[PDB]
Amino acid sequence: IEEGKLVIWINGDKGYNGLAEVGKKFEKDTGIKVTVEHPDKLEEKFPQVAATGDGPDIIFWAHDRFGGYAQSGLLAEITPAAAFQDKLYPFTWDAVRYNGKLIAYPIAVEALSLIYNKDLLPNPPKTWEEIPALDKELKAKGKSALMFNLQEPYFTWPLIAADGGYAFKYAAGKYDIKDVGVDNAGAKAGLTFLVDLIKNKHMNADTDYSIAEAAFNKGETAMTINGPWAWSNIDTSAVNYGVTVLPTFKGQPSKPFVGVLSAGINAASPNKELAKEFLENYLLTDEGLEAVNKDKPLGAVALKSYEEELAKDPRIAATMENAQKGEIMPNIPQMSAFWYAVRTAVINAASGRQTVDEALKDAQTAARAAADNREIVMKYIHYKLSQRGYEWSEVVHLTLRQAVDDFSRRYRRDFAEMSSQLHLTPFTARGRFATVVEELFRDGVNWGRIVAFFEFGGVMCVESVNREMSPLVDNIALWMTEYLNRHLHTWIQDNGGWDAFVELYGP
Numbered sequence: 169i170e171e172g173k174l175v176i177w178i179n180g181d182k183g184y185n186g187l188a189e190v191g192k193k194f195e196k197d198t199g200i201k202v203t204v205e206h207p208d209k210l211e212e213k214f215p216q217v218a219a220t221g222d223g224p225d226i227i228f229w230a231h232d233r234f235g236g237y238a239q240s241g242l243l244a245e246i247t248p249a250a251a252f253q254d255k256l257y258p259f260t261w262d263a264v265r266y267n268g269k270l271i272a273y274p275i276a277v278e279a280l281s282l283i284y285n286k287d288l289l290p291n292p293p294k295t296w297e298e299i300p301a302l303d304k305e306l307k308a309k310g311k312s313a314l315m316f317n318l319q320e321p322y323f324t325w326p327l328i329a330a331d332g333g334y335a336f337k338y339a340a341g342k343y344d345i346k347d348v349g350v351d352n353a354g355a356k357a358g359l360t361f362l363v364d365l366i367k368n369k370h371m372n373a374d375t376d377y378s379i380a381e382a383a384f385n386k387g388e389t390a391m392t393i394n395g396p397w398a399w400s401n402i403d404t405s406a407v408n409y410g411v412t413v414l415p416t417f418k419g420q421p422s423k424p425f426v427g428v429l430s431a432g433i434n435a436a437s438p439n440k441e442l443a444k445e446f447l448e449n450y451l452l453t454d455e456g457l458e459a460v461n462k463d464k465p466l467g468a469v470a471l472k473s474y475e476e477e478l479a480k481d482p483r484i485a486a487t488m489e490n491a492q493k494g495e496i497m498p499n500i501p502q503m504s505a506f507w508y509a510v511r512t513a514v515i516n517a518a519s520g521r522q523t524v525d526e527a528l529k530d531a532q533t534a535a536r537a538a539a540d541n542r543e544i545v546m547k548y549i550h551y552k553l554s555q556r557g558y559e560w561s562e563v564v565h566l567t568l569r570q571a572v573d574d575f576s577r578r579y580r581r582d583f584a585e586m587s588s589q590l591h592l593t594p595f596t597a598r599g600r601f602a603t604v605v606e607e608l609f610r611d612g613v614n615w616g617r618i619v620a621f622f623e624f625g626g627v628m629c630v631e632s633v634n635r636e637m638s639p640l641v642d643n644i645a646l647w648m649t650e651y652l653n654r655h656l657h658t659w660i661q662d663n664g665g666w667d668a669f670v671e672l673y674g675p
């Protein structure tokens with residue numbers, strides 16, 4: 169990373185040209201050049217370059233991914249003065265607090281809202297229950313009432329959780345990844361109404377984001393559920409649209425997941441002092457957010473001064489109101505298990521493979537099982553790193569401990585050749601893991617090849633620390649946990665579970 173310059177990454181759906189004007193003004197006053205870039209899939213590319221102590225000085229993304237960045241050690245801790253913290257809404261600072269430390273600057277507050285075509289529907293519906301009768305009237309005119317992305321649970325969650333569902337319980341400065349709140353009567357009521365809409369032919373089950381967006385922007389549907397990142401495309405379609413509070417369900421408000429667009433500073437950047445000055449003194453100002461906002465809308469903003477003026481726009485007041493009625497999105501990589509489990513529950517309940525009550529009950533069991541598989545992966549990687557001097561029933565953990573130790577000892581000559589020939593880069597790390605794991609289980613699954621599965625991820629975690637790519641260990645731990653949840657768990661339970669592993673290997 170070049171010292172004396174500021175390289176900034178931000179997604180293309182944001183006002184990156186407005187941010188470039190703020191950097192241009194910063195360059196005139198400091199002599200420090202600010203280069204703003206908008207790479208494709210920067211949320212995947214940032215952990216790769218930052219693992220080798222490289223990449224942008226500043227990254228813009230939602231707060232939920234910054235938890236994984238902070239735990240990896242990719243983001244530097246920010247320490248704003250108390251006079252500057254009072255300028256941002258305190259809940260936005262909460263979304264960027266991890267292990268009791270602030271790891272990002274909050275910028276904008278993103279949340280889903282109800283977007284309606286005023287020409288097709290001058291008065292939008294205030295309740296979900298009156299939507300079916302509305303679709304019937306619009307169907308006679310060749311239009312549907314509501315289309316939105318049904319494939320991602322992020323968009324269906326406002327309705328599902330409106331009557332009491334929650335993703336993870338939060339306590340003691342951490343999320344409880346075993347206390348999942350999808351198995352409740354409220355969520356089953358929300359998922360039932362969603363399935364009823366599909367089975368009554370009010371929505372198509374395979375509608376995704378692009379299908380819904382194109383349908384609303386062309387006037388084919390009266391309403392949609394989307395965030396401020398889509399307002400720019402509706403503007404160019406000339407659809408006279410309004411943005412309002414999400415409909416209520418059983419008299420209870422829809423609670424969407426709240427996302428805090430946040431600016432993190434690379435922990436390897438040599439210009440952290442400059443990045444803090446640019447973020448606090450230039451961007452996080454009324455004039456700085458306005459420059460970005462006028463390029464592309466941010467929705468609600470964390471800066472109280474500029475949010476008070478933006479709230480005059482009904483679209484932004486609705487976004488803030490829908491955010492206040494929602495909940496902050498958990499900022500942990502375990503949400504991938506939550507999303508994966510909930511998505512299957514919705515897919516299966518809509519298709520009819522299982523009941524709504526069974527789908528959410530199984531999704532809660534699957535989420536709790538993922539936490540248990542993570543426990544096995546983490547406890548092994550901690551032991552392997554501790555052997556090398558590095559720092560990061562319980563019988564199964566000590567059984568696997570003896571199994572991997574024996575495997576490494578019996579094939580130590582082979583592990584020495586592998587480690588010396590291994591060329592590990594964050595760009596090619598995911599490919600090497602996927603290729604090897606495929607070869608391990610290509611001809612079937614047994615306990616011996618599962619022990620080898622753990623030991624391979626272990627040596628990749630140790631070799632990552634050696635090549636000064638320590639944050640890559642959290643990515644490998646995530647891949648091992650994913651493969652254990654989605655592939656090996658079918659074989660493990662069918663062959664006696666982990667209790668059969670301690671029966672063959674244990675004492």
Ligand SMILES: O=C(c1cc(-c2cc3c(cc2C(=O)N2Cc4ccccc4C[C@H]2CN2CCOCC2)OCO3)n2c1CCCC2)N(c1ccccc1)c1ccc(O)cc1
Nearest residue numbers: 579582583586604607608616617618619620621622623624
């Ligand atoms: O390519 C591999 C690899 C390792 C094993 C493997 C798995 C086992 C096992 C055995 C072996 C095995 O075949 N080896 C063990 C081993 C261990 C460490 C490093 C290299 C090797 C290669 C050979 C060597 N032996 C020598 C004695 O005669 C039999 C073969 O017993 C029970 O489970 N298998 C493969 C590929 C698919 C077949 C099984 N890695 C790999 C990965 C990257 C680069 C090179 C090899 C790999 C995958 C997972 C691991 O935990 C370790 C290695």
